[PDB]
Write a protein that binds this ligand. Structure first.
Ligand SMILES: Nc1ncnc2c1ncn2[C@@H]1O[C@H](COP(=O)(O)O)[C@@H](O)[C@H]1O
Ligand SMILES: [Mg+2]
Ligand SMILES: [Mg+2]
Length: 200
């Protein structure tokens, strides 16, 4: 059955970008915070949250980081820091109607890094509580592996290859990564896949 009933009213696609360097910067800090709200049945994008985030420990973006992500210094200068962005997310969640206990939603990420490592690690560094809706998620690589019977090698690029999808936008742009996750999800649902929480 194409586009079966799903277990969630909405899927919240998320894919951070963070400060980085060669060798890696320490600590890393979130600089782009995108969320796509997908209709739970059709996987169509219905709303977008998108903020760049001002890094504080390493406030100047390295050449490497700007090359990797396309994010330039002017995009993070004058932005709120992560504490404020998380408060903006809460407000966005509330206005979207996602804070209703009877509206079921779940974050979807490519890998576990974003919500298993990046966000809790920075919130712990900053002394900030992590909102409970960030504590469960679907790892698309794992979902893809159940849907297709195989483990993708390199993330979104190989998942698009497996499904004959053209890449959307620029790799390592947070918002464009989110659109590819959404596109891959829509295809898995077309093939009949029912999504399930994978986080433990
Ligand atoms: N090849 C790489 N080298 C160093 N850091 C990376 C690399 N790829 C990703 N990162 C870091 O991981 C974050 C998330 O990666 P991604 O969703 O693949 O763009 C990036 O914003 C960088 O901070
Ligand atoms: Mg990512
Ligand atoms: Mg990304």
């Amino acid at each position: 059955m194409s586009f079966p009933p799903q277990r969630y009213h909405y899927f919240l696609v998320l894919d951070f970008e963070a400060t980085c360097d060669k060798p890696q910067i320490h600590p890393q800090e979130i600089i782009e915070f995108p969320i796509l709200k997908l209709n739970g049945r059709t996987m169509e994008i219905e709303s977008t949250f998108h903020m760049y985030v001002q890094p504080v420990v390493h406030p100047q973006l390295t050449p490497f980081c700007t090359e990797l992500t396309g994010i330039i210094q002017a995009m993070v200068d004058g932005q709120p820091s992560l504490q404020q962005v998380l408060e903006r997310v809460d407000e966005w969640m509330a206005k979207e109607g996602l804070l209703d206990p009877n509206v079921k939603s779940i974050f979807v990420t490519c890998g576990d890094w974003d919500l298993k490592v990046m966000l809790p690690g920075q919130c712990q560094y900053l002394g900030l509580p992590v909102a409970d809706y960030f504590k469960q998620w679907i790892n698309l690589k794992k979902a893809y592996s159940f849907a297709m019977g195989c483990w993708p090698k390199n993330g979104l690029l190989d998942m698009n290859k497996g499904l004959s999808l053209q890449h959307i936008g620029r790799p390592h742009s947070g918002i464009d990564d989110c659109k590819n996750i959404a596109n891959i999800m829509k295809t898995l649902a077309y093939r009949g896949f029912i999504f399930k929480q994978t986080s433990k």
